[PDB]
Design a protein around this ligand. Structure first.
Ligand SMILES: *[C@@H]1O[C@H](CO)[C@@H](O)[C@H](O)[C@H]1NC(C)=O
Lengths: 49, 39
């Protein structure tokens, strides 16, 4: 409760494992990332399909 | 960011000394001195 102001959309929620807001979820889903070398993609590059 | 050989992981957290990768740092600590890797 913050004097009637609703901060429920920008504050984090513990429902999802990545503690991001609703608007942060929309901003992350709006940009189509082209990977950042996180899952070590050489193993999938070895398995050429 | 790949894998690390020669530094043991610890279940603690300090400020970053040597930046390795996605949230991992390394330091020269006494916890016989050695090289540890932490978040
Ligand atoms: C506004 O606040 C109420 C309670 O404070 C909450 O139930 C509601 O979900 C909020 N509105 C939005 C759009 O989240």
């Amino acid at each position: 409760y913050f004097g009637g102001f609703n901060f429920s959309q920008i504050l984090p929620d513990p429902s999802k494992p990545s503690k991001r807001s609703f608007i942060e979820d929309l901003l992350f889903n709006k940009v189509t990332l082209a990977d950042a070398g996180f899952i070590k993609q050489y193993g999938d590059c070895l398995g050429d399909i | 960011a790949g894998c690390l050989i020669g530094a043991e992981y610890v279940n603690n957290s300090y400020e970053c000394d040597i930046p390795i990768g996605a949230g991992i740092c390394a330091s020269y600590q006494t916890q016989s001195q050695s090289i540890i890797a932490y978040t």
